[PDB]
Structures are given as structure tokens and as C-alpha cells.
């Protein structure tokens, strides 16, 4: 349907998959990384009804489905379900056949090896894609943001990777990776709202809480002052409409959940928080690198859309940083949608045509080729 | 029919309210940035003078 | 009631669209004021840098 | 009236209320958590007759009463009814007025605020108790059980708590509030006994099924082979005498009911069941904690009295658990009464005499004080 | 046990603290350089539970503690934690009060001066030691090894200094300090084990990887050849049992961790390694010194435990070293304990009893006195 064998770009995370073609500005479609399955016995006959549902089908029919995510903390653990998600992504909504297009997939630099290897195998064996590449999330964010140097703090649904990059090169000894993510904030919000009389323990309830989080929650610039008021007055509560007509209001819980990014102890995690790890990613780099990383804190990934987060991340690191020097945050309206955007940019670069793995080299090496050719 | 148009009109109210809220959030974000920038443009004009003063001194 | 609710749903489409359009104008206004203050703050940060360069000199 | 100004202890569950004084080894009396009301028009005059009956009065006169439970899955929603149950408990069975004694009440910390706030308020304002203390069910169960470390499985009438404790500390991120309880097991049994030709739909009938469950049911360590035989042979059916002299026999349904705890789909619940929930609470704790919790799964509350339950739980956890390691269950005779026993122990500890809210601090602060003084 | 007022000897690194009485051939007590603190809210009372745990206490109750060490890359950063470690080591384990005994503490010659001042101040002001001396770690390593001449490659947990000594004299212009030690080797392994699917980031997890490193890793005489096989065959994987009964297998990662000693670029360091510094320290020594130091290069401290390191180092130095001359590395059994042993040897010499700072000179001058009195 395209006038060129443009690469397909699929930003497959632990949240939603954003997909479209290289050279465009935006994904053609977005899909929950979900395969749904009925938890009930059918009663009426000739009702259609699938054994399993994919993406938005799984979410739309969720009233009686248990919903599973094949990707956890950035890694595919269930590749049969990813084959279904990709079939849907490519043939039902983008309506393209990867057999005629190179495909670009994304991951964090320390994502366990099985992820990129199984992603490579699925696209070469079930879709028979002519070429593959698995790209770095930080690289993709840097292209989207217009930078070659900076800290990419990618606090999304799966993991926070936090990798410093200078002149387009990794500074791997300074990756302050953290097992704290948007999915934990969602789990925390389900629990804290349960305490308000609105229990959220089932799949339908979990999807509702994620929707509540995305629309009602924030981190603010000053937690203690924000809570001093939110805990004292109803003036800071915000309502939300649930699908069945219930109305829930959230007070200080509205920010106490999200605050776990700065205070991980709220969910039992042992961590300094995302701002200290951002600071250390800069500090652990050489002294002649530090000045450029301080001036370029690059925000990407999920959770970047919480009110007060860009302002707060700059405040928290500038407060740890030395005086005289200027410390700055980069947090464009392209935040979180930067990995997909970077995929489009990267896939299309003329210099990247030497990075793509072809369905030639693949057959001689097998999917393990991804560890020889990508990064 | 009117109800179907109502649902769509209500949907438009919701979509438009969605946009309204989004713009409001952007308005406030930008306005808050405006205000932090008003504070910075002034602090910066003051720095323009503190630095100019450091130069003069 | 439904026609009245269509008129209201439509009114709400118009009101929320109207208001979101007002917010688009308020947003563009604060965005432009932000850009002005940012440009101003940046011109000052550039002057601060010119002075810093001159301070260092 | 006592030989010391000992605290009074009352363990108020969604099922039954256990009460006595601190320092004893048993409650003095147990009452159903029930307030009954006549559903018929009086015909005779000078018949006495109360507006409402409580506890054992409510059960003894139940032939014409509707029986309500003031506690909903651990939360008191009707505090006027609990005040009447408590007055009866304190003045008619314990024969001690709270005005001269501190009182200890219990709840899960998972309880959404209102229960501990109202429990504290009732005792301070309607009973004029000189002091109050709302206790943690896991704490109370571990004291009663002889442990400081382990997981409390309190699978009683209301909600399953499943909270892990290490060296006396809570590990709250691993606590999984579970909507699977003894009350649901009763409802399931009412429906499957209906299929057999013995419908149970009214209050009297609900109380009968609960009595049947308590006396005839078991879980079985191996339910599959047990049902293969129980569903095939009358030789495994047990007769129960109904109040009017009629007899009901129950076969595989006897264990089918308790099995719901391991097969929650039987009541429409989206859950892995109590063995996997316990396992996940162990898993969610740090790796140097996990081994101590695997070796110390502690039974408390109700339903833990079913034959085969200690073995069913230990074997299911062992199956989910890693090799080398020994998985063990502690199942003391202080089962179901363990929260009350723990209350007696805790109320009496010298290290807990500073934990009591006095009837001074209460009035200066109001009932919200329970959030600062108890936990 | 001690029946004489002998000097106490105590070596203190970022890893472990070794202590005992001068005149022996071993410390009588060894503790981790760790002070642990609880990161959880207590619920049970009358449980004991400390504010802080030290040494073996810190590790024994670590399931709910965050564990921190006081010494970083050779220096004390937290004097309060060192006082706790020494208080426990001297009074509880060695059962000795330093008030009645002179004490010998150690550091390499380039160690920042604040470290020597703090060691002196703590023992004189919190322990009231009658006398102090701070000795050179290279001096003590040569005494333990039976040498007066040699190069001490102190590849410990914090920092490696590689200090050359000839006829008992310092050759300070040739000390080639290296920012590579056992603590960094642990970090490398945590990242590579993450690539294998096992994330280790929290305190319990960090302790596991350190334990894995110490028990499973080796240098590899030939890195590339060992890797060609280890990367191709599972027969070279060693299975480590994790505290919860789960296991991890480690393949070429087993040697890639210690390989950082020969490849510091693995952790982002601008260095060729411990063999390069061994070579540079000798290279800058006088031309008529070199022959005696090349025939006596000395391993000291830990990381020398690698059964691959003995041949790996002599091969790497021999390759750079001059012809005609005998090139040899001394890898004594007094390894990982050589500084303490040397400390005993120095502390007990009759020729060393005039080297002590007394608790007279100390108070008149203050702790800066160590800078003039020791070396």
C-alpha cells in the first residue's frame, strides 16, 4: 500500500504497542499489549465468541475476560501471544505484510537477552520479514528530541532504564537502572483506592485504575506541602466516572501513588528514587561529560505526563548538582511518544541501512544474530 | 434519532470536553510555565543586571 | 426531553467546543507569552552567558 | 469486679464475635455477629418481644426473624447494631462494664478506615471506656501461634488477609486483600444443595447451611480423586439432620464447597485461590525473607479447621515453591480463636502499655486519633 | 583470649574488617564492614529489634535491613559506623577493651590523609586507646609474605594501589593507583547476570551477587579460549543456589567478572588492568631495583583467590617484563589476610615499640599528628 519498502515500526512495551511505518510522524494504530481470554462458561449458542481476543478486542470485551500482558518489565515472556498481537497489528489495523517490509522493534539496553532474540525470531519466522533491527529506547528518544548527548530517563510502564549517552555513545558504567515503573504505580493506586472504599482487584478493575491514573494523578513539585493541603481539605479532590456509573473521588492519594517514583519505599522498594538515579547517571560519567549531561536531562517514556514531573525532575537534580553550573531538563510534547518517533527516524536514516539484519544472514546464524548485529 | 444525535452530540461534548480539559491542562501547564518564565524572565533580567554588574565591577 | 437533551448535548458540544476553542486561544496566548518570556528569558540567559563569558574574560 | 483493671478483649468478625478479658486463655463467650428483627405481625398481646435481638438471642428466636450481619467482609457498616451486641457481650456474659477497663478490638489494616475509626468511637462515646486499642489480626495470630515470622492465613467468614510478617515487621507490599471467604463458601453450598433437591434461600436456611458446612465439610488434600469417588458413591455421603427432622445427605458437595478456596471460579471470583495468594505473598517479599516465610505458613481464623486443609495448603505451596527447600504449615488448636487469644496476649504485654489511647487523648483529637496511636 | 597487654591489630576495608591480638598468625575475629538498618514498620511488640545491626548481626537479620558500609575506595566516609564495627569487634567478639592495649590500623601510602586522621581520632577519643599507629598496607603485606622487597598488588574491595618497596624503603613516585577493585567486579557481574534474566538490585540481591562472585568466579588463564568454550558449552556453567531455593547458572560470565582486572573498560575505566599497574609501578622504579621487584611481585588482599589469577598474572607480567631476568609472582597463603598478619608481625616487633603515638602526644596535637608520626 506504500510506494516504497518502508520499514514498519512497532514500539512494543509492557503497556501499549504503538505501530505505523517509517517515515511517518505518528503510529497508524495503538494497541494494548494484551491477549484476553473468557473466564466464564458460554450459555447461548451461535454467539460467535473467541477463545482468545487481541489488543483492543481484548480490552473492549473485557467485561468477562481475564487479561494478560505477554510483556512484563520490558520483556516478552509469552511469544505466542506476541505473535497474535503482531498479527493483529500488522494485518488487521496497519493492514501491511512485514514479508515485504523491514521491521524495527525496541528495548532497554539491559533488557534480558531473550527479549531481543525472541523478537527477532518471531518476525523472521512467523512474518518472514526481509530484515530486522532491535533498537535502543534511549537512542530512539534522543533522535526524537533532537539530541546526541544527554541522560535518557525513560520511567515507563515496565522499567526505568536511565542511560547516559554522550556524542551518540553509551556510557554503560553509569546506567542507573531501576526496577520501579508505571505498572507499580498502577498497583499502588489500586491498593490505595481500595482503602477509600473502592476495591480494585480484578482485571476490569485494574484497567479502570490505569485509566484513572492517567487522567487524575500527578506528582507535583513539593510533596509535603501538597499533602499538607490535600490531606486537610476536599478542595484538592478530583472525581472520576467509572463504566457502571460509579463515581470515585481521589484526594491526597492522587499524588501519593505517583510520588513513589521519588519515594519508592511507599511500595516496599529499596531505591533512592528516579531523581537520584538521574543525578547519579550524570555524576558517574567522566567530569568532562558531566557538564553536557547536566545541561541535557532528556525525559521520555511513560509517567512523563504526570503534572509537575518535568519541573520536579529538574528541581531534584539541580538541588544535588553543584552551584554555578546550569542544569536543564528537556521534556517536549513528544515525551513518551519518543521511542516510536525515533524508530521512524532511525529506520529511515541512510546510515542505518548498514545496521539492518537481512533474511539471509538470519538463516545462517539463526535469531542469535541479533546479538552480533544490533547492539 | 435525536437521542442518537444526542449521544453523538454528547460524545462531542465529551470529546470537546476532553479537548477542553486537555487544553486546560496544557493551558495550565503552559501558563504555569509562563509564570515560572515570567519569574525567570524577570530573574533573568535581574541576572542580566547582576551579571552586567559583575562585568561593571 | 431528548430534543432538549440534544439541544443540551449539542449545547455542551458547542459549550465544550466553544470553551475548548477559547482555551485554544488562551493556550496559544499563554504559549505565545511563554515563547515570548522564554525568548526573553533566553535572551537574558544569552546575555547572562555573554556576561559570563565576559565575566570569565 | 476483676482482680486487676485488665483490658477487655473483643474480636468482632463478619461471622462471630469472640469476647472475654485480657489475661484469660479463651473468650468467656462467643456470639454470632447478628442482629435479628421480626418479619411478622404480632397477634397476641403482653408477649414481650424486642425490636431487635442480638447474638445468641438473635439466633435462638430466628424462626421469625430476618438475621442481619452489621459487618461486611471485615467492615462495620452498622455501628448501632454493633453497640447493642457489645452491650450484651460486656454486661450479660462478661459481666464487666467497660467504663472501668481498657478495650482491645481487632481488624485487618487493609480495612478502609471506617472500621477502626468507628470501633474506637463506639467504645469511647457509648461505653465510656478509659482507653482503646485497635489491633492487627496478623499480629494477634502470630502471638497466639508462637511466631514472630510467618504468613497469617486467616481465611474466616469475611475476607482472607494473607499478611506476611518478618521479625515482628509487616511486609505491607506483599499483603493481598482477598475476596474469598467462609461466607462465600456457604452461599455456594446453598446453591449446590438446591441442585440436589434441598433448596436453601431464606435466613433460617442460610444458618442451616453454615451449620452443615461447619460439621460436614472438608477440603481434601486430593480433591480430584476424592470427587471421582464421592460423586460416584453414596458410601461417601454424610447425613445431616435439618431442624424439622428432615434429612439431607451430602456427597462430593461436602468438599466441593471448601474447594472454592482453591477453585474461586466456583463463585465467580477472578482469583488464583488461597494457596497461590499465600505463595505470591511469600514471593513478593525479599529473597532473604522468602525462605523464612515458606517454612512458616501459619493458619489462623476460620475454614482452617477443614480436614485436609493444612495438607492441602502445604502441598499446593510446595508444588509452586522451589526445590531443596522445606515448606511448612503451622496450624494451632487456637484456630479461629487465635485473633482473640492474641488480643489477650497483646493487651497484657508490658511493651504494649504505651500503645493505648486514653479517654483524654481521644477527646482532644477525636476518632481520627486511631490513625496516630494504633498503627 | 589474651593474657598480655599486646597491641591490637585491625585491618579495615570496604569489604571486611579483620581483627585480633598482635603476635598471632590470624585475626581472631572477622566481620563484614557493614551496619544494617531496618526499612520496615514494626507491628508486633516485645520483639526486641535493634535500631542498627553491626557486622554479622547486619547480615543475619538482613532480610529487612538496608546494608551500608563506611569505607569507600580506601577511605572512611562514616566514622560512626567504624566506631560501631570496632566496638563490636573489640568488646563483644575479641572481649578486649582497647583502653589497656596499643592499636595498629592500616592504609596504603596514597590513601587520602583524612583516613589516617579518622583512624587515629576514633581510637583515641571513643576507645581511649593508650597508643596508636597507622601502618602502610604494603609494609604489612611484605612482612606477611616474608619479603622486604617486592611490589604489593592489593587488589581488595575498594581500591588497588600497587605499591613497590625495596629493602624496606618506599618508592612513592612509582605508586600507580587504580580505580578498580572487588566492589566494581560485583557491579559488573550484577549487570551481566541481568542480561541472563536475573536482576539483582536490592540489598539482599547485591549480597547474593557478591557471594556468587567469591565462590563461582575465576580469572581464566586464556580469556578468549576460555570464552570460546564457555560461550559454546553448558558443561562450563556452574550452578549457584540462591537463598530461596531457586538457582542461577553462570557460564562465561563466571570469568568475565574477574576479567575486568585485565579489562577495566568492562566497567568504563580508562585502564588496561592490574597487570598494567603491576608493570608500570616496576617500570618507574630504579633500573637497579627492577630485577629484585620483578622476581618478587606480590599478591595481597582479596580477588587473588581466583584459581585462574595465579597463572593469568604471571603470564601477563612476563609478557611485558625484560628477558634474562627471572620474572615471578608470589601468591602466598597469607592472602586475603596478609595485611592483618603483617600487622601482627609489625605490632609485635621490639623495634616497633618506639613508633607509637601516645595518648599524650595525641591530645596535645590532635589527630593531625598521625601525619607527622607514622610515615
GROMACS .gro file of C-alpha atoms in nm, chain E residues 213-221 254 258 299 303-313 335:
model
   24
 1077UNK     CA    1   3.141  -1.385   4.268
 1078UNK     CA    2   3.351  -1.505   4.560
 1079UNK     CA    3   3.252  -1.871   4.519
 1080UNK     CA    4   3.200  -1.918   4.141
 1081UNK     CA    5   3.436  -1.687   3.956
 1082UNK     CA    6   3.790  -1.738   3.828
 1083UNK     CA    7   4.012  -1.525   3.606
 1084UNK     CA    8   4.079  -1.765   3.309
 1085UNK     CA    9   4.441  -1.822   3.202
 1118UNK     CA   10   3.188  -1.671   3.554
 1122UNK     CA   11   3.728  -1.100   3.715
 1163UNK     CA   12   4.973  -1.058   4.554
 1167UNK     CA   13   4.046  -1.114   4.446
 1168UNK     CA   14   4.381  -1.305   4.446
 1169UNK     CA   15   4.168  -1.605   4.539
 1170UNK     CA   16   4.091  -1.669   4.172
 1171UNK     CA   17   4.244  -2.009   4.083
 1172UNK     CA   18   4.292  -1.853   3.740
 1173UNK     CA   19   4.467  -1.541   3.866
 1174UNK     CA   20   4.793  -1.711   3.969
 1175UNK     CA   21   4.885  -1.809   3.617
 1176UNK     CA   22   4.700  -1.526   3.449
 1177UNK     CA   23   4.908  -1.265   3.629
 1199UNK     CA   24   4.635  -1.389   5.101
   0.00000   0.00000   0.00000
